[model samples]
Target: VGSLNCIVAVSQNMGIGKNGDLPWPPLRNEFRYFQRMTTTSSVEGKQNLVIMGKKTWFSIPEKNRPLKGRINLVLSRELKEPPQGAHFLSRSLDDALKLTEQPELANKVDMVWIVGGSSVYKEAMNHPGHLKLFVTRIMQDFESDTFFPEIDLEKYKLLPEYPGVLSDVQEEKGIKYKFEVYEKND
Candidate 1:
């Protein structure tokens, strides 16, 4: 079985995306944090599996497609196959998680990360499995069309200081943000 996790950044009001893209202005520091979290693998030969909705995948820059050094799994039923650079295709969150369990992938995957749009995150939250949600609480509120799904407090609790995660409120380009981790109670 794959251990699932999610990494996302939300504004003060929990808004994540606006008009299919990031609502807040670019923050290179925050972006680097995301890269480091998703790319770092503790196991010598294993790589993390990053799952994303079709829109999320499309939102990535063309030159940076498939994100390098990880297994990119795009979850979308509308698309019959994996997008140009993605390594695998998934029609549902459950199916996507199952794909990682195949004999061929069992040894290759180190972590299963869901980085997504609202629906995908919602599904993952309800999936009743282990999930560590790494959320960046951006101090400024940005008007956004998409928002992060509310976590069931009974099931997930925010950690005071998650290992390897920077705890200080960092400022970049005048925007303040902090990295936070939420782990499932079970």
Candidate 2:
């Protein structure tokens, strides 16, 4: 079986939306950023998939969960269907890879982005066999209820980082973070 690559992104402290609409900023909403990264590559063709836990899936705007174009795999010990537009399934991190490894499916989605809350990323970090991660730094000092665990610097090495530029409309702009890619030691 081929190995599965999970792209995990996190921001230490952040906020999600306007008023009460914000999704889990550093955790779930990071998918929005990862979407941009994939567009920077040939991955736009594969229309790669994004796997996440239930809470993270729900954290997103109801109509936006499956995110459009990309596949969304929602993981949970419970729940049979993933709301309206997602592919819901029950699995541990190991099981998720098994589904991805299917010969019929792997070719369709070349990579998997693990956009998440703390526990999901933590689980993937435990077994990064062919895993890759992308980290973006958020500049806002937001008050939130969720968090990302500290990364295991020893298990992975940083590939490269690119700084973000501030040119959007928001007046209280955020500190742009570089894209950091990490590969596990073989």
**Model 1 shows how many backbone clashes?**
0
List candidate 2 segments past 4 Å from native.
1-9, 12-32, 38-45, 161-176
- TM agreement with the true structure for every prediction: 0.96, 0.73
For candidate 2, lDDT tens digit of each residue in 76-126? 877765667876474666677778767656777756667776677878877
lDDT of 1 at 121: 93
**Quick one: best TM-score, which candidate?**
1
lDDT of each: 0.88, 0.60
Encode model 1's per-residue lDDT on 1-186: one tens digit a residue: 346889999998889998888999999989998998898887888998899999999999899998899899998889998889888998999998887779777899898888898899999988885788999999988999999998889999989998888899999989999999999935
Give the 10-residue window scoring lowest on summed lDDT in candidate 2: 165-174
Error of 2 at 46 (Å): 2.8
